[PDB]
């Protein structure tokens, strides 16, 4: 089953981007739908063999084959439909691998799209959109960098010494100066998840324009 | 009683500013305390006769008289204390008028200090800090301006026609095109007060760095 290998992608609140690759284009549209165009070259020009349109929740997949014959020319935007409609769990295996391409893209975009920026007395924290276990960067004013992933934890020092850690396994053992930074960065993390939760809940009820991205505080 | 004429001022979250006037300096410090320096000129130079330091909540007033004799020279910052301490309700009448000077300043600063900026599909709304009945500007993307005070309501049109209204007394009667804008601006207002309320409540519990100013959304 497809659900056993990935979760449906979520493109809500992500800025539009049309990213070209050698055999394909993957796109986050204005509608927040995620589009993947399959691209083949013939006669020294590039065409579009099939299109996978995914809804903003990755539940609905629309698929069409534009026809020349046999295809449509590459453009600044995706071809108009002229069609098969699936739900995530009824998507046939031949398309899974492609969906994972779009899925894997969104996931990466999400991990770089700030969701909550928060300014403390010592640092500008940034909770990213790749929930759950979203990336979390703490850019201290004094120059120190910290970055948290679901797995590992990278630290940089003013000096620029760059290094990384496992799941807090190595946590206790560190320069207690560093102990000071990580505590404060974890304080920020608790704060940001709380803010995420309440704002999310109010957004759930409100139903109009998004409450993220969000910058909070100053200095 | 002083409380019968004004409320204690609140300087929380307001950016520092040292504003000179002809007979005085009024200042919002880094500590968020609000300082008023009384200034007199002698011998072609300016001095400082007395200083009124007010806590960030306007409850505590510290008052001193720096001595030359008879005074201290004007500076880039307020004179250091060398003193009388009052609480708002025990402040003697001779100082009320001065406190109202600082009070009236803060109030004006508050009315221009954004608290929540919120981006909709049609406009960037801005709830200001002068609570309650805080000023509320709606800057539509298409050019239209709207501004709400506790009393009156100013509208500008793309054309730049500038005009104002009483307490919605005149509300119903307007170009229904204008009816469209005001409804959406009032939608934003409901949203911003709700966000203010929940974020405020979480801030009340959290107790660390401020949750305002705050920018919310995009486009």
């Amino acid at each position: 089953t497809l659900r056993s290998i990935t979760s449906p992608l979520v493109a809500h609140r992500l800025k539009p981007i049309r990213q070209k690759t050698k055999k394909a284009v993957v796109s986050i549209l204005d509608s927040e739908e995620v589009c993947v165009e399959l691209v083949k070259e013939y006669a020294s020009q590039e065409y579009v063999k099939e299109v996978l349109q995914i809804s903003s929740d990755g539940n609905t997949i629309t698929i069409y084959y534009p026809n020349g014959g046999r295809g449509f020319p590459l453009a600044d935007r995706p071809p108009s439909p002229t069609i098969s409609r699936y739900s995530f769990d009824n998507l046939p295996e031949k398309y899974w691998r492609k969906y994972q391409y779009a899925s894997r893209f969104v996931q990466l975009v999400r991990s770089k799209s700030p969701k909550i920026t928060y300014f403390t007395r010592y640092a500008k924290c940034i909770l990213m959109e790749n929930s759950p276990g979203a990336d979390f960067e703490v850019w201290f004013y004094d120059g120190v960098k910290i970055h948290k992933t679901e797995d590992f934890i990278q630290v940089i020092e003013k000096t620029g010494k760059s290094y990384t850690l496992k799941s807090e396994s190595e946590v206790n053992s560190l320069k207690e100066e560093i102990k000071m930074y990580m505590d404060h960065a974890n304080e920020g993390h608790r704060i940001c998840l709380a803010l995420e939760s309440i704002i999310s809940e109010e957004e759930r009820k409100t139903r109009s324009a998004p409450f993220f991205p969000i910058i909070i505080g100053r200095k | 009683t002083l409380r019968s004429i004004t409320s204690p001022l609140v300087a929380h979250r307001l950016k520092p500013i040292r504003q000179k006037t002809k007979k005085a300096v009024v200042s919002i410090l880094d500590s968020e305390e609000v300082c008023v320096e009384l200034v007199k000129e002698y011998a072609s130079q300016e001095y400082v006769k007395e200083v009124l330091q007010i806590s960030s909540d306007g409850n505590t007033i510290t008052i001193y008289y720096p001595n030359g004799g008879r005074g201290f020279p004007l500076a880039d910052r307020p004179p250091s204390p060398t003193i009388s301490r009052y609480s708002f309700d025990n402040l003697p009448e001779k100082y009320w008028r001065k406190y109202q000077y600082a009070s009236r300043f803060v109030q004006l600063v508050r009315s221009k200090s954004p608290k929540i900026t919120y981006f909709t599909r049609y406009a960037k709304c801005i709830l200001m800090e002068n609570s309650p009945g805080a000023d509320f500007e709606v800057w539509f993307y298409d050019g239209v301006k709207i501004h709400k005070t506790e009393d009156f309501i100013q509208v500008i049109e793309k054309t730049g026609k500038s005009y104002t209204l009483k307490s919605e007394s005149e509300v119903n009667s307007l170009k229904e095109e204008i009816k469209m804008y005001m409804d959406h601006a009032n939608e934003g207002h409901r949203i911003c007060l709700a966000l203010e309320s929940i974020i405020s409540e979480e801030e009340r519990k959290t107790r660390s760095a401020p949750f305002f100013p705050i920018i919310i959304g995009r486009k």
């Binding site: 063999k49 492609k98 994972q100 700030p114 500008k124 940034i126 | -």
Partner: peptide, 29 residues
């Protein structure tokens, strides 16, 4: 239809986009 699972997408076109997203918090700087 040779497969796309290969495709590498994170290029400098993207880095810029990523740049853009962080630009907004770049306000007190």
């Amino acid at each position: 239809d040779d497969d796309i699972d290969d495709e590498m997408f994170y290029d400098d076109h993207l880095e810029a986009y990523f740049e853009q997203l962080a630009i907004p918090g770049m306000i007190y700087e």
